[PDB]
Structures are given as structure tokens and as C-alpha cells.
Amino acid sequence: CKSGGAWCGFDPHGCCGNCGCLVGFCYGTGC
């Protein structure tokens, strides 16, 4: 799982916390 601010792309919903790849980077309020 991404630790935030990590590149994903293929996985727009693949993040440890409640963050998403709104632009390719995990951005939320948990990770």
C-alpha cells in the first residue's frame, strides 16, 4: 500500500489510508 504522495496511476484507489490518486498521487486524510 502507498504511504501517500506516491505514484499509482493503474491503481487510482490503491492506498493504505483514505487517499486517492486524484492526479496520480495518493491524496487523502489518513495515509
What is the DSSP code string of 1-31?
-B-SS-B-SS-TT-BSSS-EESSSBEESS--
Q: What angle is formed at CA 31 by the lines to CA 22 and CA 27, rounded to 5 degrees?
A: 15
CB neighbours of 22 closer than 8 A, spacing ≥ 6? none
18 with 29: CB under 8 angstroms? yes
5 with 18: CB under 8 angstroms? no
CB neighbours of 13 closer than 8 A, spacing ≥ 6? 20, 21
Q: Which three cell numbers mark 3?
A: 504511504
Method: NMR
Distance CA 9, CA 28 (A): 15
> In 10 A of CB 20, how many CB atoms?
17
Q: Which three cell numbers mark 5?
A: 504522495
